[PDB]
C-alpha cells in the first residue's frame, strides 16, 4: 500500500499472508471461517504455499503465528485471465485455523447489498509502500 | 521490498461509470474501483481485503485485483466485486 500507515497489531484479524515455501510473501487473503480463505485467482496459489494467520510484523520471531497448510485450491471457473474478471479463489485449509483475539473471520455481503460510490472503506496488506 | 509490518489505508469507492473514465472498457461488472485519493494498493497487496463497515460489522466488499503499473495514487485501484461472486463462494462452501 502506497501512502498507507502501519496498522494496530492484530486489528485486522482476518488478514492472512500467502507465503511460498522459501518464506516469501506474494499475496494477501482473508479468513471467512476456520477452514476457508478467500484470495485473488491471479495469485496462482498451489498446495505447496502456506497461509500465515495472526501475523503483524514479518520480521519478528516472537509473534505466535499460525502456519496453515492448504488442502485444495478452488479457482472460480468464471475467472478470465485475459480480462482479469471474476478474480477470486477459495483455499480450503488442511488444518483449521484457531480463532483468537488476533485471528477471526470477516463477514461476507449478501448479493443484494449496496455499497455506494463515495463510501470510505479500508484496504490492508504487506504490498509495496513505494514503487 | 514489501514492508515488514501490516499497512492499512482508508479510501473511497467509485462507481463503475466514473471508473471507466480512467480504465475504459477494462472495467467489468464483477469489478469495483476504489482509491484515486492519495493512496493505492500495490504489488503484493493482491488477494487482500477491501472492507466496508455495514451495520457495525466489517464486510468484504472487494479483493485486491489490479491497477496502475506504477501504483499511482491518483488512479483508482480495481478490486474483485464480492457481491457478484458471493453466490459462488456460498455454493463452494456448501458443497465441500
Amino acid at each position: 500500500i502506497v501512502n498507507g500507515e502501519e496498522a494496530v497489531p492484530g486489528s485486522w484479524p482476518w488478514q492472512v499472508s500467502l507465503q511460498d515455501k522459501t518464506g516469501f510473501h506474494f499475496c494477501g487473503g482473508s479468513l471467512i471461517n476456520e477452514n476457508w480463505v478467500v484470495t485473488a485467482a491471479h495469485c496462482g496459489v498451489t498446495t505447496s504455499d502456506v497461509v500465515v494467520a495472526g501475523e503483524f510484523d514479518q520480521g519478528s520471531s516472537s509473534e505466535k503465528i499460525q502456519k496453515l497448510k492448504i488442502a485444495k485450491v478452488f479457482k472460480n471457473s468464471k475467472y478470465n485471465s485475459l480480462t482479469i474478471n471474476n478474480d477470486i479463489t477459495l483455499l480450503k485449509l488442511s488444518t483449521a485455523a484457531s480463532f483468537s483475539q488476533t485471528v477471526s473471520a470477516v463477514c461476507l455481503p449478501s448479493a443484494s447489498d449496496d455499497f455506494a460510490a463515495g463510501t470510505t472503506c479500508v484496504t490492508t496488506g504487506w504490498g509495496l509502500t513505494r514503487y | 521490498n514489501t514492508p515488514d509490518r501490516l499497512q492499512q489505508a482508508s479510501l473511497p469507492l467509485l462507481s463503475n461509470t466514473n471508473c471507466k473514465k480512467y480504465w475504459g472498457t477494462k472495467i467489468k461488472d464483477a469489478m469495483i474501483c476504489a482509491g484515486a485519493s492519495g493512496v493505492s494498493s500495490c504489488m503484493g497487496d493482491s488477494g487482500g481485503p477491501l472492507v466496508c463497515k455495514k451495520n457495525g460489522a466489517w464486510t468484504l466488499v472487494g479483493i485486491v485485483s489490479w491497477g496502475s503499473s506504477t501504483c499511482s495514487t491518483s488512479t483508482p485501484g480495481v478490486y474483485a466485486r464480492v457481491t457478484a461472486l458471493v453466490n459462488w463462494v456460498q455454493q463452494t462452501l456448501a458443497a465441500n
Binding site: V8, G10, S11, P13, C107, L108 | -
Partner: peptide, 10 residues
C-alpha cells in the same frame, strides 16, 4: 464475523 477483538485505529 467482522468485529475485531482489537479495535482498528484509523
Amino acid at each position: 464475523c467482522g468485529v475485531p477483538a482489537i479495535q482498528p485505529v484509523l
